[PDB]
Design a protein around this ligand. Structure first.
Ligand SMILES: Nc1ncnc2c1ncn2[C@@H]1O[C@H](COP(=O)(O)OP(=O)(O)O)[C@@H](O)[C@H]1O
Ligand SMILES: Nc1ncnc2c1ncn2[C@@H]1O[C@H](COP(=O)(O)OP(=O)(O)O)[C@@H](O)[C@H]1O
Ligand SMILES: [Cl-]
Ligand SMILES: [Zn+2]
Ligand SMILES: [Zn+2]
Lengths: 63, 63
């Protein structure tokens, strides 16, 4: 059930910048990192000079 | 925001056995463990001989 909760929280938090697309993520190690923004908004953030929305949280994948 | 998510998931999952009371939990280390059952149902499970509902998940408290 932890895995279904991770999935549920991933599906209810859209990108903070565009409010439509899902967030980017990576499986680092044995942690899942959910970044604040989709990939397209993150790259845009780099081009326009804004980093106010950079960030992420980590969730581990056991139990 | 991770902390508000942990709180949200704790508030939406009641005890698996009695379906009313919130689950028991402990802060082990720097992990939060949410057990499957309230304390009163867990102790009952020990007295009646059923362990079908024993278990828990772990959530870390960073990011
Ligand atoms: N898609 C994204 N949305 C928001 N923040 C991001 C995104 N991608 C990268 N970042 C930011 O980049 C920084 C770290 O990059 P990352 O590759 O996660 O870690 P590492 O330092 O291991 O490469 C963090 O502050 C992270 O929030
Ligand atoms: N309230 C509860 N609800 C469900 N399972 C429980 C509960 N309390 C203890 N358990 C079970 O007891 C076992 C481990 O006990 P616990 O104290 O969490 O770990 P430790 O082995 O570090 O003492 C686990 O299988 C756990 O699910
Ligand atoms: Cl977690
Ligand atoms: Zn976006
Ligand atoms: Zn109960």
């Amino acid at each position: 059930k932890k895995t279904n909760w991770l999935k549920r929280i991933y599906r209810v938090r859209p990108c903070v910048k565009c409010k439509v697309a899902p967030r980017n993520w990576k499986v680092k190690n044995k942690h899942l990192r959910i970044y604040n923004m989709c990939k397209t908004c993150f790259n845009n953030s780099i081009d326009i000079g804004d980093d106010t929305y950079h960030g992420h949280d980590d969730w581990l994948m056991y139990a």
